[PDB]
Amino acid sequence: MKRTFQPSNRRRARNHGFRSRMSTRAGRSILAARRRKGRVNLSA
Amino acid sequence: GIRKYKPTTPGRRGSSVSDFVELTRSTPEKSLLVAKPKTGGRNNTGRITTRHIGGGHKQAYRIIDFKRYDKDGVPAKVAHIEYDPNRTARIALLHYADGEKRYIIAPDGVGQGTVVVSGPEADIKPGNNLPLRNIPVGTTVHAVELRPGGGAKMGRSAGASVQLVAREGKYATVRLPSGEMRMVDIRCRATIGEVGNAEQININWGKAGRNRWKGIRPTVRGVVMNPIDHPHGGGEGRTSGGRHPVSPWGKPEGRTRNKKKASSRLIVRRRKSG
RNA sequence: GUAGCGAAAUUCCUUGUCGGGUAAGUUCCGACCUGCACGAAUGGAGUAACGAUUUCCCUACUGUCUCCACCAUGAACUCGGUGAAAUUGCAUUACGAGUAAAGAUGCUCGUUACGCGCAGCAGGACGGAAAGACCCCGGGACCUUUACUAUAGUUUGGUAUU
RNA sequence: CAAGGGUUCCAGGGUCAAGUUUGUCUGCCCUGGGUGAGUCGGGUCCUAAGGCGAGGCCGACAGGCGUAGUCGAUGGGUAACCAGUUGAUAUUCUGGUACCGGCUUGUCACCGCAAGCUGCGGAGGGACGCAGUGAGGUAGCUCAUCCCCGGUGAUGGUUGUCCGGGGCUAAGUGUGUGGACUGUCUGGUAGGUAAAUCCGCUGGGCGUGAAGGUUGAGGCAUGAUGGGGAGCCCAUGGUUGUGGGUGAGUGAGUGAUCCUGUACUGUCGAGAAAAGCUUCGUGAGCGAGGUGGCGGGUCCGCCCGUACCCUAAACCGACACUGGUGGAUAGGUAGAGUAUACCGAGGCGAUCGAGUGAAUCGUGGUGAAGGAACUCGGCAAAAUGCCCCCGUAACUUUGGGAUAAGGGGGACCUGAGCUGUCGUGCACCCGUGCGGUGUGGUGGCGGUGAGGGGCGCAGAGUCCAGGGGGAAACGACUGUUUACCAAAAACACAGGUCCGUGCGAAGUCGUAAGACGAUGUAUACGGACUGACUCCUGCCCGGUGCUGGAA
RNA sequence: GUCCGAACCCACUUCAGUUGAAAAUGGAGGGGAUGAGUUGUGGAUAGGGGUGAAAGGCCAAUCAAACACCGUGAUAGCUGG
RNA sequence: GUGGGACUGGUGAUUAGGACUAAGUCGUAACAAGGUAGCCGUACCGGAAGGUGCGGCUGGAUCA
Ligand SMILES: [Mg+2]
Ligand SMILES: [Mg+2]
Ligand SMILES: [Mg+2]
Ligand SMILES: [Mg+2]
Ligand SMILES: [Mg+2]
Ligand SMILES: [Mg+2]
Ligand SMILES: [Mg+2]
Ligand SMILES: [Mg+2]
Ligand SMILES: [Mg+2]
Ligand SMILES: [Mg+2]
Ligand SMILES: [Mg+2]
Ligand SMILES: [Mg+2]
Ligand SMILES: [Mg+2]
Ligand SMILES: [Mg+2]
Ligand SMILES: [Mg+2]
Ligand SMILES: [Mg+2]
Ligand SMILES: [Mg+2]
Ligand SMILES: [Mg+2]
Ligand SMILES: [Mg+2]
Ligand SMILES: [Mg+2]
Ligand SMILES: [Mg+2]
Ligand SMILES: [Mg+2]
Ligand SMILES: [Mg+2]
Ligand SMILES: [Mg+2]
Ligand SMILES: [Mg+2]
Ligand SMILES: [Mg+2]
Ligand SMILES: [Mg+2]
Ligand SMILES: [Mg+2]
Ligand SMILES: [Mg+2]
Ligand SMILES: [Mg+2]
Ligand SMILES: [Mg+2]
Ligand SMILES: [Mg+2]
Ligand SMILES: [Mg+2]
Ligand SMILES: [Mg+2]
Ligand SMILES: [Mg+2]
Ligand SMILES: [Mg+2]
Ligand SMILES: [Mg+2]
Ligand SMILES: [Mg+2]
Ligand SMILES: [Mg+2]
Ligand SMILES: [Mg+2]
Ligand SMILES: [Mg+2]
Ligand SMILES: [Mg+2]
Ligand SMILES: [Mg+2]
Ligand SMILES: [Mg+2]
Ligand SMILES: [Mg+2]
Ligand SMILES: [Mg+2]
Ligand SMILES: [Mg+2]
Ligand SMILES: [Mg+2]
Ligand SMILES: [Mg+2]
Ligand SMILES: [Mg+2]
Ligand SMILES: [Mg+2]
Ligand SMILES: [Mg+2]
Ligand SMILES: [Mg+2]
Ligand SMILES: [Mg+2]
Ligand SMILES: [Mg+2]
Ligand SMILES: [Mg+2]
Ligand SMILES: [Mg+2]
Ligand SMILES: [Mg+2]
Ligand SMILES: [Mg+2]
Ligand SMILES: [Mg+2]
Ligand SMILES: [Mg+2]
Ligand SMILES: [Mg+2]
Ligand SMILES: [Mg+2]
Ligand SMILES: [Mg+2]
Ligand SMILES: [Mg+2]
Ligand SMILES: [Mg+2]
Ligand SMILES: [Mg+2]
Ligand SMILES: [Mg+2]
Ligand SMILES: [Mg+2]
Ligand SMILES: [Mg+2]
Ligand SMILES: [Mg+2]
Ligand SMILES: [Mg+2]
Ligand SMILES: [Mg+2]
Ligand SMILES: [Mg+2]
Ligand SMILES: [Mg+2]
Ligand SMILES: [Mg+2]
Ligand SMILES: [Mg+2]
Ligand SMILES: [Mg+2]
Ligand SMILES: [Mg+2]
Ligand SMILES: [Mg+2]
Ligand SMILES: [Mg+2]
Ligand SMILES: [Mg+2]
Ligand SMILES: [Mg+2]
Ligand SMILES: [Mg+2]
Ligand SMILES: [Mg+2]
Ligand SMILES: [Mg+2]
Ligand SMILES: [Mg+2]
Ligand SMILES: [Mg+2]
Ligand SMILES: [Mg+2]
Ligand SMILES: [Mg+2]
Ligand SMILES: [Mg+2]
Ligand SMILES: [Mg+2]
Ligand SMILES: [Mg+2]
Ligand SMILES: [Mg+2]
Ligand SMILES: [Mg+2]
Ligand SMILES: [Mg+2]
Ligand SMILES: [Mg+2]
Ligand SMILES: [Mg+2]
Ligand SMILES: [Mg+2]
Ligand SMILES: [Mg+2]
Ligand SMILES: [Mg+2]
Ligand SMILES: [Mg+2]
Ligand SMILES: [Mg+2]
Ligand SMILES: [Mg+2]
Ligand SMILES: [Mg+2]
Ligand SMILES: [Mg+2]
Ligand SMILES: [Mg+2]
Ligand SMILES: [Mg+2]
Ligand SMILES: [Mg+2]
Ligand SMILES: [Mg+2]
Ligand SMILES: [Mg+2]
Ligand SMILES: [Mg+2]
Ligand SMILES: [Mg+2]
Ligand SMILES: [Mg+2]
Ligand SMILES: [Mg+2]
């Protein structure tokens, strides 16, 4: 059937992209937390 | 007028439609249109603040001159009478005798070719716009300004009518279509005559679809909701509200006008009653 | 408690009573009113048309049935290849009448039974799957209100702005 | 093709793993290779929804909103086609022939408070719904005694039209047939943010009763002496390609979902924006007496994508999963059809098999007599089914009910006449040299056919394809709903009533500013209940609520 | 918001499946099919909140208050060890 | 034979009014100004006669 994940690169980049995260202070703190943890992927 | 539909199909059975006899032109003036995207009843916060709004046929806004006093003394010919989807009245397209074209609410009785004018020395004819000090007492006007220079705000819908009853001092007393008696500044402008298309209220839409493309979404009455959704919600089987009638937000029925504002200019309340 | 309607999606008694339909009708349709406990915009009574709605009947039609038979196929079955699953205290795991935590393969007294497989059927192992939802007790959640205590909001007056 | 995937694509080597079996094979592994654009799809251009937002306003802080702006396609704008080639790429490379923008150059013509260029805006334009019919075309398709290239048949016949195949070419340019568009010459001018000679609004003169002009469905010409297109050659090389051998390009029928066409007609629910573009000036600067125009020549033309899968074994579903996935093309015969049956272009034989008349389960098939006796219940199945013609009840809101019900005919052979269209041809208007027009043609093709006839159990012979009637309850109706046990009598609904709201509306979101309501104004808006329509809607204000009043 | 009927959308009945081909489907029928239709792309509304032709429905395969992390080794007169 | 209509008779639980009969019950509506003049059409109301509104009539009258 139609499943939950329907990919769209533009929507993904607008939602979880680096600039989207940098727009708000919550996203900036998320990037900081991922940097502290050591993720190689800071954002989508 | 109104044209009654024949009962060929259900939903067309009791319905009716205006015959559009007064329209002289089936297209609008291109230079007086702006885009009017739909809101769906949503706020600038993106939430529904006015319910029951959405969908409907696409519409283009017609720029209506509700001031009329920046063309004082310039006669205009009523070039056309045409349809405005944004209102229950018709719109008269006016060709001023200087090249400027404009739109007004079409007064009842005016048609293609008649000459309208604005100003204190304007003649008292339907469609002419004058200050209230110059409009004679006992006259039926429309498109009345609350504050001088603010533009038309009262008596604008189809068939609307305002009665000028007195001009004592620096205030003119007007009976609004609600029947309320109100005082306004004599310098406030008004257009002679009443609004046309007065018979549109008798239109039977006869069809859920016609309001659906008029832009009205279905209305779910609160008594068939759940208690979390509406104070009238709940109950086993069909019930009443289980309480006195209230709004979906728990506000009891009652007068809601702010008792302390411009009440010093209201002579008597509308007196709907029964 | 009016018009209207009434054993009704409402009638407990109840398969009320009478009438129609059937060879036979607790359902049905028309009546009666004795309305346990109808009723007029939480609308009353009707209503052509509409309905994958509910109910009754007639006709046509048939394997629905009397009453099943036969045919072909995908599994099943045999051979070669590949190869799981839930479950699992144990094992060389009968029946009868008993007995016992009151329903026994396992205890008593008897009876029967050579060892091991294959295809099958589901009576039992209180079979498997889900720390019963029903019930109660403890906790929680959400909902309600003329429960308590508060509060946003709305409103009153004072005072500052004055 | 898009989305998504990301090297799966190609060649060679490999068979541990993966593949529901095997495997020499692979979408697997290993190595190397493969994607070429001024025109295609995006960016360099434009805006929609929406996002962000200099200042700004609002908010203890954090922040909210928003102006000027600036982004943002799913839309607007925008110049190229055919053929050929590779193991893998092709509106990209190559061939042929075009187009667009620059730079530069040759030549001709022209300007000069007064060139031009660039900014800046004005106006025009871009620019818009839904539904329907018809007309003129073309694509396509069919047929052919016509033109080509073959064939003469394993078994009776098969050298005449008997059989098979083919009967082709683009963008661009020119032409201007249908069709469409369009009076002309001057004057004035409260408007178009600064202006306008470009617009708008108005005054006159003349004016066919259309005549020119402008335009451009197709056709023709050109592009094209080219390209493409079968079987004959010493030969090739023997699952091969080379050089010659390419032959034809006819006519009719039928006919679009395409073109004219945003046409035309109908219609209420009244159907984006902005830029490019044309023109107008000048609220800006540049700029010399140098530019700007029309034909001709040279060079310059950027970035990203381009392989491959893609109604799927490569995407979304943990799988190489009977599921889901937007768009384009979509031939023949029977048919109303994009249904269905069998076929075409093309692609597949499906990723464990071999057997064997067990019971049994699934999936189909048939059935004597009976025909709902089954069962909670006609559940399932059967019957009915198509077209044409005849005919059709209670009731009704006059529309319906209705395909009511209930009947007849259908295919095959032959076939008189009637028609669609074309036709060499007759005469004729000819504006002929018109790409024409009306009479008019033995005929070809197609459609339709009264009548007559044949055969069978059966002629809508297969697939496909309503059972019908009577009555009651509920809801008027079409719709909507518990994704994953309830589709209903529930919700909605059109209609109705009451209450609120005089506009900074009430109401709602928010701390606020603001916003929706609404660029609406009481014939409106918000809330409540009721729920088409018909006839109606009684009595009670004590209680509670609401409204008003204030001793 | 006509009728019959494909695509398309739906999900009424039945059978099968129910360690499925499939964490909701398949076969046979069935409803809508010019409309309150359906669908693509992008966008908006966010957790006591959204949205809801209203079923407490839906909000990333279990919603009478999502998910993740944190307070946190919550607490449990209860069950187990 | 089959099918769908047309017309019509009997019958029908139940129900409606009509006629007649107790010398039944309930009121007194009309006939006199019948004790509210009567009646006509219509409307609503009421156990029942009737009551009332609107318009009309004299087949009523007071007072002239
Ligand atoms: Mg998801
Ligand atoms: Mg314009
Ligand atoms: Mg925001
Ligand atoms: Mg509403
Ligand atoms: Mg509107
Ligand atoms: Mg409910
Ligand atoms: Mg509540
Ligand atoms: Mg309630
Ligand atoms: Mg109840
Ligand atoms: Mg009974
Ligand atoms: Mg009972
Ligand atoms: Mg009986
Ligand atoms: Mg009442
Ligand atoms: Mg009530
Ligand atoms: Mg009730
Ligand atoms: Mg009702
Ligand atoms: Mg009813
Ligand atoms: Mg009915
Ligand atoms: Mg239904
Ligand atoms: Mg029978
Ligand atoms: Mg088998
Ligand atoms: Mg085996
Ligand atoms: Mg015992
Ligand atoms: Mg025993
Ligand atoms: Mg024993
Ligand atoms: Mg022992
Ligand atoms: Mg065994
Ligand atoms: Mg077995
Ligand atoms: Mg057993
Ligand atoms: Mg058990
Ligand atoms: Mg359970
Ligand atoms: Mg337990
Ligand atoms: Mg549980
Ligand atoms: Mg508690
Ligand atoms: Mg919970
Ligand atoms: Mg105060
Ligand atoms: Mg004060
Ligand atoms: Mg790629
Ligand atoms: Mg590789
Ligand atoms: Mg790979
Ligand atoms: Mg490969
Ligand atoms: Mg293997
Ligand atoms: Mg290999
Ligand atoms: Mg290989
Ligand atoms: Mg730019
Ligand atoms: Mg914007
Ligand atoms: Mg700032
Ligand atoms: Mg820009
Ligand atoms: Mg952009
Ligand atoms: Mg390729
Ligand atoms: Mg090519
Ligand atoms: Mg080339
Ligand atoms: Mg412009
Ligand atoms: Mg427009
Ligand atoms: Mg022979
Ligand atoms: Mg041929
Ligand atoms: Mg001017
Ligand atoms: Mg100016
Ligand atoms: Mg045609
Ligand atoms: Mg490529
Ligand atoms: Mg490719
Ligand atoms: Mg494909
Ligand atoms: Mg698949
Ligand atoms: Mg996968
Ligand atoms: Mg055909
Ligand atoms: Mg097919
Ligand atoms: Mg083929
Ligand atoms: Mg394929
Ligand atoms: Mg496989
Ligand atoms: Mg066997
Ligand atoms: Mg059968
Ligand atoms: Mg037989
Ligand atoms: Mg039989
Ligand atoms: Mg028989
Ligand atoms: Mg029979
Ligand atoms: Mg029976
Ligand atoms: Mg029985
Ligand atoms: Mg059935
Ligand atoms: Mg059948
Ligand atoms: Mg009919
Ligand atoms: Mg029939
Ligand atoms: Mg014949
Ligand atoms: Mg027949
Ligand atoms: Mg057929
Ligand atoms: Mg009834
Ligand atoms: Mg009943
Ligand atoms: Mg319904
Ligand atoms: Mg209804
Ligand atoms: Mg329906
Ligand atoms: Mg829906
Ligand atoms: Mg469900
Ligand atoms: Mg309404
Ligand atoms: Mg307000
Ligand atoms: Mg606003
Ligand atoms: Mg209701
Ligand atoms: Mg009282
Ligand atoms: Mg009361
Ligand atoms: Mg009070
Ligand atoms: Mg329809
Ligand atoms: Mg689809
Ligand atoms: Mg269901
Ligand atoms: Mg089952
Ligand atoms: Mg229908
Ligand atoms: Mg988004
Ligand atoms: Mg509930
Ligand atoms: Mg979910
Ligand atoms: Mg909670
Ligand atoms: Mg909620
Ligand atoms: Mg703590
Ligand atoms: Mg603990
Ligand atoms: Mg325990
Ligand atoms: Mg009788
Ligand atoms: Mg009396
Ligand atoms: Mg009397
Ligand atoms: Mg009375």
Numbering used by the authors:
A (entry chain 1): 1 to 44
B (entry chain c): 2 to 275
Article passage:
Sarecycline (SAR), a third-generation tetracycline-class antibiotic with narrow-spectrum activity toward some gram-positive bacteria, including C. acnes, was developed for acne treatment.
To determine if SAR’s interactions with the ribosome are different between the model (T. thermophilus) and clinically relevant (C. acnes) organisms, we determined the structure of SAR in complex with the 70S ribosome of C. acnes, mRNA, and P-site tRNA at 2.8 Å resolution using cryogenic electron microscopy (cryo-EM). The overall resolution of the EM map of the 70S complex is 2.8 Å. Overall, the 70S ribosome structure from C. acnes contains 20 out of 22 ribosomal proteins of the 30S subunit, 29 out of 33 ribosomal proteins of the 50S subunit, whole 5S, 99% of 16S, and 94% of 23S rRNAs. Two novel ribosomal proteins, bS22 and bL37, which were recently discovered in M. smegmatis and are absent in E. coli ribosome, were present in our structure. In addition to the CBS, we observed a second binding site (SBS) for SAR. SAR’s binding to the A-site of the 30S subunit (or CBS) allows it to inhibit translation initiation, and its binding to NPET on the 50S subunit (or SBS) may enable it to inhibit the early stages of peptide elongation. Here, we demonstrate that the low rate of C. acnes resistance to SAR (10−10 at 4–8 MIC) may also stem from the dual binding of SAR to the C. acnes ribosome.
